[PDB]
Design a protein around this nucleic acid. Structure first.
Ligand SMILES: [Mg+2]
Ligand SMILES: [Mg+2]
Ligand SMILES: [Mg+2]
Ligand SMILES: [Mg+2]
Ligand SMILES: [Mg+2]
Ligand SMILES: [Mg+2]
Ligand SMILES: [Mg+2]
Ligand SMILES: [Mg+2]
Ligand SMILES: [Mg+2]
Ligand SMILES: [Mg+2]
Ligand SMILES: [Mg+2]
Ligand SMILES: [Mg+2]
Ligand SMILES: [Mg+2]
Ligand SMILES: [Mg+2]
Ligand SMILES: [Mg+2]
Ligand SMILES: [Mg+2]
Ligand SMILES: [Mg+2]
Ligand SMILES: [Mg+2]
Ligand SMILES: [Mg+2]
Ligand SMILES: [Mg+2]
Ligand SMILES: [Mg+2]
Ligand SMILES: [Mg+2]
Ligand SMILES: [Zn+2]
Lengths: 50, 46, 93
RNA sequence: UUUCAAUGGCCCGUCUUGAAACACGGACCAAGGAGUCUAGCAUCUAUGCGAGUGUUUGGGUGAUGAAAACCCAUCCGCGAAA
RNA sequence: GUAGAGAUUCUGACGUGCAAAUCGAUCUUCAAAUUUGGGUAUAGGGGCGAAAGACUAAUCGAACCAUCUAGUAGCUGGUUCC
RNA sequence: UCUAGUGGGCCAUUUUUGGUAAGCAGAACUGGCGAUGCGGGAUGAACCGAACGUGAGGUUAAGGUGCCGGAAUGUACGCUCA
RNA sequence: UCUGCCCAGUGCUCUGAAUGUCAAAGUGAAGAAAUUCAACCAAGCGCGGGUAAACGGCGGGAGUAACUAUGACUCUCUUAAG
RNA sequence: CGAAACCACAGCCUGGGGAACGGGCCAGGCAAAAUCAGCGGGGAAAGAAGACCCUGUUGAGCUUGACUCUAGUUUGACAUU
RNA sequence: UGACAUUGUCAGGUGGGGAGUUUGGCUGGGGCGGCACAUCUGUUAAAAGAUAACGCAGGUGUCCUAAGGGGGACUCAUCGAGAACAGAAAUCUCGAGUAGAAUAAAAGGGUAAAAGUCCCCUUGAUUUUGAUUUUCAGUGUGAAUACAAACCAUGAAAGUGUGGCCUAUCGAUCCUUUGUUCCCUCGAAAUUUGAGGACAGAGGUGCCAGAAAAGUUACCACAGGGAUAACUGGCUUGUGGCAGCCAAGCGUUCAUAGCGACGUUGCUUUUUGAUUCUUCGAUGUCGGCUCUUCCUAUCAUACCGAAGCAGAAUUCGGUAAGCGU
């Protein structure tokens, strides 16, 4: 037999379509301020992520 | 067709053997309901 | 068939070249040594890749083996072998 | 030699029990086109020598001109015993 | 319904063709799972597949090129003068 | 002594078995064809006669002698009208 | 709008209480030693539980009706469920 | 102006026998130059070493609780320690 | 997180995901079936020997320590007549009794002071060699015959006995395994383990002169085969249909107006079948449409014959295929 579809999903045409994505969603690198106190940030944008 | 998939082929569209396949199946035979504890329509679960 | 446990027959042994009494038993194959050259050769051949390297009998029939009588001269310790026709049943004495 | 008359004459090759076959190949002509050479073995024949036989693994006349001819030692093969 | 994209029927034309797939009429779709240029990725037991064993340069139930290779053939054909 | 081809047969007479039967299948005996031309049976592998170097003459076999066609529209006695 | 019954079979899944078997390695004994003989061990395993919008099942076997076979008739097993 | 397929040799019928449906063989019917346009009876017309079937100690694609293996995977021993 | 894990090596399990390969023969095509694949008896078999079919009727791959070997004694299957007991010819007795019984299993052959039955003793169902017969290549295997050298059994003895009264009942190489010897070898020399040999057997190969082996292709390939099927011609007629002869009869009465059994002689078949002679380097395949021609086994049309008033209706009856259908 031939290589089944599930076995072909290893890269290539099955990679994620990521051109329209602005960045990974991440917490913030755990640093001194967060370990011991707090740090303030301001929400600049709320955006749709394709 | 059988060349394409373990489910392929036959003079009717049917699987042939059970679709619950073992956890330690090789790639290319690990298709269908993998290592299923049970199957069928559950009536009350937890 | 029924075969007496004792029979008086010619003894081919060098010290008793005459008719003497013998104790009769059925012959059974011995237990297949691992040191026999053919087994050493077969084991060496079977190692490595290539799979089964020699024929192996997958069937069996004709379970009527020829009965072989082992005749032991009572006093001389001399043993002789006698072959009988095939049969399904055997009993000594 | 051509032609006529009288009498006879089916299309070759092939496989086949059997081919003119409604079996296959063949439109025509030229040129090309298929049992070889080698390591063995067996019988038969010829030749040399014969209880022996085999100079060419080698070495020499050798340099002139030398892939030849010609010469020469020890082994060895086969044979002389099963 | 037009451009575009298709290809149902005539089982029409053609069928040593205009053409190794075309021509006419008819027909399907025509603002989206739409059509398409260029760039780019996936390569042969591999790819790619809204799945027909389809498609992968007129090649696909495993492409194309060279080599192993003068592959083997208990089979077909041939096998040359009196 | 060494070695080739062969290891699909087939036809007839006579003896047969199987089969409803068969231009059928299978055996027995001999003669044949295959490998056999020639005269005869209009025709025809096997039936009849006869087996073949190139020719002259003679005579035959099987079969013929109204014409085709070489050879008595011969002889004798009957039968027969379709 | 419904999605019935069946977990016996085959799959899947969870058990270590089976140590029940058992490789390699290691441990004990005999031997001069190769080695032999014994126990010991994992998983897999036999069991056991679950599982059908898993594969599937929701009757089967049978001997016998005028060529043979026959499914007429003759009978049961029914079983996981009928 | 100008191909091609195809082509053993060819080309009028009936009957016979015959590899059992002949253009050629045997017996008959017959038989007269050179040609044009059509036609679809025949040439068992052409095409393609039957694609059906069987045989071959010839394959391939596919399947599986066939035979023999194998990536992987799982468990143990030993080393890392 | 942590000396675990990972990694390396080896081991056990799992592993159509993947690889390689195999998946008998005969055969009235192949398949299915069967086994005619190793063998026996009667027949086919044509009075020597040989002789085929998936011809016919039957057997066999066992069984037996006696159902083998020797000796002795006796005679069987049946029939008849008596006695019992009570049908029962169970038993017992006497006559006749050529085997009509038995002899393991098929059939054929053989056998009567035995080869059958009973009894007594036994292990010749043993070791060794060559010769021979059958199948036959005059190879193997199987089976069998006559001897020889031993050792035995039995019998008073002559003798008989090397399995089964005769004709069937079975197995190479390699490997393993067993038996056997004051046996040979392990190649620098020894001893002891272990291994290897020579000789005689057994493991088992029934596809029986002896591979280790599942399917599918409705996607298919190649070499071929008319040695071989469907097709295609041709042949055959078991079926069926039709036509004669026979005349018991139906037909109030007259056996054949018209019907007409049991038999018997023919024709045809467009029926599948049978066979396998042509065709597998290829003869396009049903029906319909179209179109022509031929046959007659005549539906209609022409002319004729017989049964009863006409009228008709039947025998289309007899000629006859011109012309329609
Ligand atoms: Mg598959
Ligand atoms: Mg002529
Ligand atoms: Mg020939
Ligand atoms: Mg010819
Ligand atoms: Mg031919
Ligand atoms: Mg040919
Ligand atoms: Mg040609
Ligand atoms: Mg030339
Ligand atoms: Mg068209
Ligand atoms: Mg060549
Ligand atoms: Mg080649
Ligand atoms: Mg004349
Ligand atoms: Mg012709
Ligand atoms: Mg061909
Ligand atoms: Mg495979
Ligand atoms: Mg054989
Ligand atoms: Mg063989
Ligand atoms: Mg299909
Ligand atoms: Mg099919
Ligand atoms: Mg398909
Ligand atoms: Mg033929
Ligand atoms: Mg032929
Ligand atoms: Zn002794």
């Amino acid at each position: 037999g031939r290589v089944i579809r599930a076995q072909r999903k290893s890269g290539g045409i099955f990679q994620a379509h990521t051109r329209l994505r602005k960045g990974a969603a991440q917490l913030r690198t755990l640093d001194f301020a967060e370990r011991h106190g707090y740090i303030r940030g301001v929400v600049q944008k709320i955006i749709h992520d394709p | 067709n059988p060349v394409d998939h373990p489910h392929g082929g036959g003079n009717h569209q049917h699987v042939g053997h059970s679709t619950t396949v073992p956890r330690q199946s090789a790639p290319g035979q690990k298709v269908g309901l993998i290592a299923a504890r049970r199957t069928g329509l559950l009536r009350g679960a937890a | 068939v029924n075969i007496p446990k004792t029979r008086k027959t010619y003894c081919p042994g060098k010290n008793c070249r005459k008719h003497t009494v013998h104790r009769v038993t059925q012959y059974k194959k011995g237990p297949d040594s691992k040191l026999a050259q053919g087994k050493r050769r077969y084991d060496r051949k079977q190692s490595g890749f290539g799979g089964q390297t020699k024929p192996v009998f997958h069937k069996k029939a004709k379970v009527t083996k020829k009965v072989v009588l082992r005749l032991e001269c009572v006093s001389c310790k001399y043993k002789n072998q006698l072959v009988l026709k095939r049969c399904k049943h055997f009993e000594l004495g």
